[PDB]
Subunit: 78 residues, 4 copies
Amino acid sequence: ANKRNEALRIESALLNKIAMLGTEKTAEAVGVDKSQISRWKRDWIPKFSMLLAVLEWGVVDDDMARLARQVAAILTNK
Amino acid sequence: RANKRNEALRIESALLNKIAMLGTEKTAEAVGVDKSQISRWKRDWIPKFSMLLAVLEWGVVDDDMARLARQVAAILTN
Amino acid sequence: RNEALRIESALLNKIAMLGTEKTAEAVGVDKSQISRWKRDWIPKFSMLLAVLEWGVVDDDMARLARQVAAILTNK
Amino acid sequence: KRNEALRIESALLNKIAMLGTEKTAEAVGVDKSQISRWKRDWIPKFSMLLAVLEWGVVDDDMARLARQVAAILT
């Protein structure tokens, strides 16, 4: 349900940030030869992408956002 | 004169701070794990991962940095 | 249950300000304990101070609330 | 100095006495055979916390906090 959808939520922001930076730089800025990394995404990012989801890494994120753009509400609105 | 090194460390902290705090309470499916548990896993891919997370400039939230946010945020929210 | 709670909230923000890790180090508490610290000891001492009608209050957690108002309140 | 802690434990132990070394240990909770073990490791540590928490955490210290505390509150 949510521990799985929200894990994949992270598999996705993770893959996306590789993408952004460069599959290349995000791979020599962080070990793992071209061939190994990428087809590593296949099997090992999904795994510790659940992990983050397990730590609620979301609520903190989301809460750090809820509160953020909630205090940005005494600004938006008063 | 650290740029990435440090954060791969700041991040890596709060992680094994949670893979023990909530850790092998649920962490074998949380990451679908070998015969059974392995923190020998963690020293394998958590440090690399923390790097990635750092490289990806992924999140932050120091645990007592949050609290302060929250408090300030509550102070600014009444 | 008393303003012991109020006090707890204070001490924790101070610890947070100064830094949970620097503060454990500066105080006795080693990273091993920091939780016990925050979950038995802080609350318990907070009662004592409440009972002791001690008081010491969050002025510093003010300067922050407002000092985050300085930067955020302007762009 | 950091016998600032001593002056604290001192003032704490005074308020305690001045109020009741039991009217107090129940006001907070805890009894006689442990009530004595309380005076010594606990009060001092708390005094030390109080004395640490009583260091300046100066301006620039207050700035890096106020900065990133707010860097997340946006």
